Amino acid sequence: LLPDKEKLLRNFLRCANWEEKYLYIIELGQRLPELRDEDRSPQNSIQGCQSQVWIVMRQNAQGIIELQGDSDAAIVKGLIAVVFILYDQMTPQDIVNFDVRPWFEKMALTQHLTPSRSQGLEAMIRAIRAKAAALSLEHHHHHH
């Protein structure tokens, strides 16, 4: 399976150099479960990642998010796994108020990946939070 966020950060920082870090991210991506051919459709497409990206978020029998995704770009799929780890086992509202910025700063991703890659990472985060917000946002009564 995928390590929790605490272990991800510790293993990442334990890598002796950036090639090891880069291949570790890709390795995690390859560990993601296969995406149902049925879910690999436009409805689940994410734009702005310089590649094909698919992400599906659904709530189980309880109110906890279950995330699945894929990318035709290995490094992008790895970033998908990194975000899944950080948002793992959270309710929609937990995802909305969870600040991931400090985790990425510690990993120093934006400083080692291409700007285009970093933008793709921001796009998926924004897309996941958007989906989490649509499930928890307030429909204020003064707006009915």
For position 77 contacting a copy of itself by CB under 8 A, the verdict is no
Stretch that binds a copy of itself, among 36-44, 81-89, 114-122, 136-144 (CB under 8 A): 114-122
**Pairwise CA distance, residues 105 & 13, whole Å:** 12
Q: What number of other Cβ atoms are within 10 A of residue 110's Cβ?
A: 15
For position 75 contacting a copy of itself by CB under 8 A, the verdict is yes
Q: Select 60 or 111, whichever has its Cβ closest to a copy of itself.
A: 111
Tokens of 59: 């709530």
For position 112 contacting a copy of itself by CB under 8 A, the verdict is yes
Q: Select 2 or 23, whichever has its Cβ closest to a copy of itself.
A: 23
Give the contacts of 110 (CB within 8 A, at least 6 positions apart).
104, 118
Q: Are the C-beta atoms of residues 54 and 40 closer than 8 Å to each other?
A: yes
Active site residues per annotation? 49
Count how many Cα atoms sit within 13 Å of the Cα of residue 16 in the half-sphere of its side chain.
Answer: 0
Give the β-pairing of 45-46 and 65-71. Answer: unpaired
Stretch that binds a copy of itself, among 2-10, 16-24, 85-93, 133-141 (CB under 8 A): 16-24
Stretch that binds a copy of itself, among 32-40, 60-68, 83-91, 105-113 (CB under 8 A): 105-113
Judged by the rule CB under 8 A, the positions of this chain that interact with a copy of itself are 16-20, 22-23, 75, 111-115, 117
